[PDB]
Amino acid sequence: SRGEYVVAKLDDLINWARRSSLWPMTFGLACCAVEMMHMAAPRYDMDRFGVVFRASPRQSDVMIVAGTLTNKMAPALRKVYDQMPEPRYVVSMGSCANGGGYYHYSYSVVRGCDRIVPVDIYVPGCPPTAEALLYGILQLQKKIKREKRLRIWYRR
Amino acid sequence: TYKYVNLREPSMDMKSVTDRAAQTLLWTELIRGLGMTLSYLFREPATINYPFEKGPLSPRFRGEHALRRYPSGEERCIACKLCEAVCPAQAITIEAEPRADGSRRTTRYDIDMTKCIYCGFCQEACPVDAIVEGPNFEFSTETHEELLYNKEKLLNNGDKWEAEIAANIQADYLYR
Amino acid sequence: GVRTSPTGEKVTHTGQVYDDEDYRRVRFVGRQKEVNENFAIDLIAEQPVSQVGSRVISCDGGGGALGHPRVYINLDKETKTGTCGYCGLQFRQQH
Amino acid sequence: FAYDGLKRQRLTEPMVRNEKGLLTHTTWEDALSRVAGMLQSCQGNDVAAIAGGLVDAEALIALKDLLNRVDSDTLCTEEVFPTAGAGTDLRSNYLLNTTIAGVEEADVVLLVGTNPRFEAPLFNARIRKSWLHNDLKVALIGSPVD
Amino acid sequence: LHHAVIPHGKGGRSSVSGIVATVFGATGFLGRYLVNHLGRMGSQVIVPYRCEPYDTMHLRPMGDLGQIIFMDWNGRDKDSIRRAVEHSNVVINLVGREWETKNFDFEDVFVKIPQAIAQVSKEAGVEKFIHISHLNADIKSSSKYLRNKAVGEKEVRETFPEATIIKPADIFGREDRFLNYFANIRSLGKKTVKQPVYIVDVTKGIINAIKDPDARGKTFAFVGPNRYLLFDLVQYVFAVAHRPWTTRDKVERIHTTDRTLPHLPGLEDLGVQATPLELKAIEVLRRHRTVQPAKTV
Amino acid sequence: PTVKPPTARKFIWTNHKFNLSGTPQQYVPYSTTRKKIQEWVPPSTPYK
Amino acid sequence: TRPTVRPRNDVAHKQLSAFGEYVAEILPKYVQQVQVSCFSELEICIHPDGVIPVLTFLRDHSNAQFKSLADLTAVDIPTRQNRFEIVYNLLSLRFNSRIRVKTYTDELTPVESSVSVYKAANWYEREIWDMFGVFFANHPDLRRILTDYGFEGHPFRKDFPLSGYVELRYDDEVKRVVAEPVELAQEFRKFDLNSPWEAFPAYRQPPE
Amino acid sequence: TSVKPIFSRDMNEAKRRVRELYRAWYREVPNTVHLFQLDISVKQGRDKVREMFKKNAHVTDPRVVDLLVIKGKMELEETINVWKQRTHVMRFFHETEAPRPKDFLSKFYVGHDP
Ligand SMILES: NC(=O)C1=CN([C@@H]2O[C@H](COP(=O)(O)OP(=O)(O)OC[C@H]3O[C@@H](n4cnc5c(N)ncnc54)[C@H](OP(=O)(O)O)[C@@H]3O)[C@@H](O)[C@H]2O)C=CC1
Ligand code: SF4
Ligand code: SF4
Ligand code: SF4
Ligand SMILES: [Zn+2]
């Protein structure tokens, strides 16, 4: 119908604007912070995608969990995720954020950040390269591109 | 065999004192810093055009794991569990048995890619070049269990990437 | 050399397939069961048996340092061919 | 090598008879209730017990105390030992009283009615070691086995 | 019983509870805490979702890996219902709307879709089916909600005769539409008597109804421990919240007294101690803060 | 590979595939072993 | 033995043996053993009552001047009745040398805090409280430094398991990160690696 | 049998330190329920304090109860200073944990544990 066409074009508009202006809050926990900083470094340059360098956590769009989540910092991660306005996304960078990694069997490590927050992109590596992290951010943008918020709203 | 950083006593004649006062009032070093930033403004940036331009790698690069085969279709892995014995994160889970023609072959070859530390001790422990850590780094997932590889996924990665993996091993096996 | 269970599920080169009353098929609902369709037991059986004139043959798998460790296969039994324990290539004394 | 029989034919779940007379899977509550409802109706010689060949002593005294609560002494084994005379009262008349090690101290071994090669293969291995090193004289009463 | 569905572990996150659940309407208020309480035992939860997958993301940390299977479905597509339920050993229905929409009236949400879910669950061989009615569901009710929910309860009973049908009165929690409705109304006081039940009590009731083989074919009435008049309840809500979207069908249900059904079993017959509202109302309404308890009957 | 082509093998995929995550063609993990313990199937005949 | 063997340093071995005799005869009240390894490191094994008199001496004697505390360590050896082995590593920048002062305690005997000698120790032995449960008396602010705030037990004890007893997850019911008894989806696979053959006959212990 | 003390020469000074620690926790509990904005009552938190003290009431060694008073003061110092979050205070109340089977019969039903 006509309303189906209008909500299709408006979903395309809002998804274009949300994926083309992603603002990350990076948790610089461990070694993956260095490779996030290389994804911001002038070779890869996240800012040319509209992905700014160090937005404040009250205005960020994605939470990049870059490093080991210990048990002593799991509620801090949860509190920052609760303070993020929607639509918020979470990229899990590297093996300790993904599944505990090299510290999986430790007494003090959350076995993957997915026990604390919902995770949208899992970027594997130890550390994953800055090109691999930029790949994960572009896959997150493609995930935002195919969101159907107003179309499902028009069908509900 | 050592040197003194910042042990210069500055000259107190009217020439040097007037030089430092002109630097203070007329902001000469601030213009120097502005000039260096302006000099980078007119340089070509170092930014490659990802995804269309890729970062440089080498045949030693340790990316996505793969199980390899012989040049006959037979898989190289003969179930010796050296890779999971050397595995520093215990990402590899192996169960084996003799198959229908009596060969020593695995029935479980799991690699948890979210325990894996990507150090490639498995591919240097491997005596038949069966497990390799191949060249792929662009294999991010939307779900955690899509990074829990079984034997089928690793053999499919080997069949997918063998044309590149074999040439990287051909480039690097003389250093090994 | 893949085949299929009566549930419509592919059977792996190991032989793994879920039962019909196993709930764990629900993980492939809306998705796919990933199997590899190049079964190595069928591919090594396509290789022709190598006729050699010696009594003991060496095999390293081909490629020299790129193959497996070089082993020595006896070929005195004429009932059975001599199989490489690593690569599965089989040999026969031609006499 | 009999450890692979330890994963075939295994009883994993409680089973009861259905309305059609077939063993169907059930919970522990249903199976133990249907056994206890019959055990409460029994008394005296109404309930007995046969212990098998692989049963630990803990389950043996468990089933003995359970049937003694219903006043039943009929707890039996499948392997017959004669209760004539002293019976199972004194331990000496049903043990290998010497030892397995005491075979090395013997000089005449008399074997009656047994094939100790297959009934107790390392008791036979100890007999052969005493045969070989101590010049043991062995005699057999029974069929001429190897 | 199949070997993969025998319970193992100590009942934690990596355990196996032996419960393979298809929870329709798992993206709501009740489905949130039900999928939480199922996923912490180690249950295979199938969540069929209608909405955007973003709006399901909060269900993902609730279980171990592979223990929540998200899949698309539609209320008017029985093939998707069969695609969701044909591996489960229990199917819980939680589909509901407080308002009728352009595409789904109260008869679609309460009569058509529960009968469809229960019929496809009957013919696929699902062992247990739990359906959630409302306590005040009546054919001669003043509100279309309760009329269609009584009709749908009758149809679920006649198409899945072993269905555990559960009657909650009024559910309160952090994401409710009962105390958050009263805190954001800033309609009146009448002779309406209510006994509201807590969401963790309802969730423990649903899980104990899964585990109980006696709960097949029963009808349970989940009520709170204290009956309140509506006026002093709303005054207690404005007192705890530090205070001085609607429709007329919602107002008809607010002014419906919570009926007394003593012959139906409740939370105590499943082993759930019903939490009084004075223990949890502070937890619910702390967010609305920028208190002597109410009188019962 | 126009100058130096890769070494041809019969098991190498003739069709390359991109990252299939988020699609119905994606990898789903599973145990590749068979069943460890065999259960005793009771007799289907009656016992009287 | 030229290319692949580590060359032995005999001058440093002689000098460290002589200085070990020196320390053992200046402080006979506390020094229990003095030993020098084959790679030329001096260990002074003392009684735990002399943590402050020995370490002040090495800090202040004109022929010691161990002005640096490199590292402070505990080692849990459970077959010893004094199962914790407190290891001080000292550096003399003047004499270009390192010394090791080892002592002992169990769970209940407090070690005297060495913060009055080296302030460097202020966190280190605090770590020894957190990881091992060795109490340090007259410490300024003794509390945990590395474990989580509600942590029970001391992790670097060897009877403490590799994973803990509790693990965290976010729970949406209570809206809170919660602690639960630990379950692993894959148990840590214990590998028995030790060869049944003797490797070093120079380290053979006498039999019983 | 002659050991070095920590703070207490015998059990009398030790019980005095236990008693002062219980006093300090009893005084602290309403401030803890307020500033962490816990969803419990002061009676319930003080019952948890009493439970944690009476759990260790079987100990007859002065050094062990000295270290228990030391660790209780460390817990209290981490609670007065807001070093714990709400999560660390509520880990004493095992709220998300299912109740364990206590009798023989339900432990027999659920698994192999004694
Ligand atoms: N106090 C209470 O809330 C009480 C509730 N109940 C009943 O309990 C159940 C759950 O309650 P509650 O959590 O509050 O409900 P919610 O409004 O919070 O959510 C209901 C769920 O049903 C889904 N749903 C609704 N309409 C449709 C439809 N047409 N097709 C497919 N899915 C649909 C929603 O999915 P989506 O996210 O896509 O919209 C949502 O997941 C309901 O059946 C309700 O009638 C009974 C008594 C008291
Ligand atoms: S996944 Fe590995 S490399 Fe990355 S931050 Fe963790 S420990 Fe460092
Ligand atoms: S790369 Fe290292 S951590 Fe990963 S599987 Fe191989 S040995 Fe294990
Ligand atoms: S991959 Fe290599 S090291 Fe690992 S079991 Fe197979 S043959 Fe052995
Ligand atoms: Zn070969």
Side-chain angles (χ1 to χ4, degrees), chain B residues 58-148:
Chain B
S58 68
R60 295 186 185 182
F61 177 70
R62 301 201 295 263
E64 188 179 4
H65 292 277
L67 290 172
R68 294 181 66 243
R69 291 176 183 267
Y70 287 109
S72 69
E74 178 63 37
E75 60 191 4
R76 286 172 180 266
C77 179
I78 35 84
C80 71
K81 299 176 176 68
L82 261 61
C83 57
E84 70 171 0
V86 80
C87 184
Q90 292 188 358
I92 305 166
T93 306
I94 296 167
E95 296 185 358
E97 74 187 4
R99 65 182 184 186
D101 59 355
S103 177
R104 185 185 169 103
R105 301 294 166 185
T106 58
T107 57
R108 180 186 294 275
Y109 194 91
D110 297 331
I111 295 173
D112 191 357
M113 304 295 287
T114 68
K115 293 178 187 174
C116 177
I117 73 168
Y118 296 91
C119 72
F121 289 181
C122 51
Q123 70 179 356
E124 69 190 7
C126 185
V128 292
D129 294 331
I131 191 66
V132 287
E133 187 168 357
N136 190 6
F137 58 94
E138 291 166 348
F139 62 108
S140 299
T141 60
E142 295 183 357
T143 311
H144 186 190
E145 61 263 15
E146 303 178 4
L147 293 173
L148 273 67

Side-chain angles (χ1 to χ4, degrees), chain E residues 7-11 40 174 204 279-280 282-283 286, chain H residues 34 37-39 95-100 110-111 113:
Chain E
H8 294 290
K10 290 179 76 72
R40 69 178 65 182
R174 287 188 181 91
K204 291 181 182 295
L279 295 177
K280 301 293 181 181
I282 177 63
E283 179 174 359
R286 191 181 296 276
Chain H
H34 180 73
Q37 57 182 357
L38 300 177
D39 291 325
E95 290 186 350
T96 61
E97 299 180 359
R100 296 297 299 163
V110 300
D113 291 329

Side-chain angles (χ1 to χ4, degrees), chain E residues 57-68:
Chain E
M57 284 299 118
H58 65 281
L59 296 175
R60 292 184 181 270
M62 291 180 182
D64 200 73
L65 298 181
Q67 295 297 107
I68 301 100

Side-chain angles (χ1 to χ4, degrees), chain A residues 30-32 67-68 94-96 103 125-127:
Chain A
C31 334
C32 270
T68 308
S95 292
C96 298
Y103 309 97
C126 179

Side-chain angles (χ1 to χ4, degrees), chain G residues 14-208:
Chain G
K14 183 177 175 67
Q15 290 171 358
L16 288 171
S17 295
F19 182 73
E21 291 176 353
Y22 185 78
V23 175
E25 69 194 0
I26 287 178
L27 301 166
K29 189 179 179 181
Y30 302 113
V31 172
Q32 293 173 351
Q33 286 191 0
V34 171
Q35 61 187 356
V36 183
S37 65
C38 66
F39 52 89
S40 297
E41 288 184 353
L42 177 63
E43 292 178 352
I44 308 299
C45 302
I46 67 169
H47 194 277
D49 289 333
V51 170
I52 303 299
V54 172
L55 292 175
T56 307
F57 173 76
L58 294 172
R59 196 268 306 273
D60 283 329
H61 186 68
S62 298
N63 291 120
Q65 307 187 16
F66 291 94
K67 296 292 189 290
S68 179
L69 177 65
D71 184 74
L72 171 53
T73 308
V75 173
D76 191 7
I77 303 164
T79 187
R80 296 178 183 177
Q81 64 180 358
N82 296 315
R83 65 180 289 179
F84 298 113
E85 194 180 16
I86 293 98
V87 175
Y88 292 88
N89 287 313
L90 301 179
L91 177 62
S92 179
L93 282 76
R94 178 63 62 200
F95 298 105
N96 199 3
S97 294
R98 292 183 185 273
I99 201 171
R100 185 176 300 121
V101 175
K102 295 163 72 173
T103 185
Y104 56 88
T105 195
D106 57 355
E107 297 90 352
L108 297 178
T109 300
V111 182
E112 183 66 31
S113 178
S114 64
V115 292
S116 65
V117 183
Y118 300 102
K119 299 288 187 290
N122 193 5
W123 284 8
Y124 280 104
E125 65 192 2
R126 181 176 165 189
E127 180 179 358
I128 297 174
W129 170 253
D130 197 0
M131 298 297 107
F132 293 94
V134 171
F135 184 72
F136 286 89
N138 303 115
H139 194 274
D141 191 3
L142 191 65
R143 57 187 175 90
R144 69 180 67 251
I145 186 169
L146 293 179
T147 54
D148 197 0
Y149 290 103
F151 192 82
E152 295 179 355
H154 301 287
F156 287 178
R157 295 187 179 182
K158 282 187 178 289
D159 53 352
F160 194 86
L162 184 61
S163 300
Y165 295 99
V166 293
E167 62 180 359
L168 297 187
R169 68 176 181 86
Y170 178 72
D171 189 73
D172 194 80
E173 172 188 358
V174 296
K175 297 294 188 293
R176 189 173 66 243
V177 174
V178 300
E180 288 176 354
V182 58
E183 292 182 354
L184 297 173
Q186 191 179 10
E187 181 183 0
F188 180 76
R189 287 172 288 169
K190 186 181 95 276
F191 289 167
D192 286 330
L193 295 176
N194 296 321
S195 180
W197 290 95
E198 184 180 2
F200 308 110
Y203 293 92
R204 184 179 296 117
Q205 300 180 0
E208 292 85 4

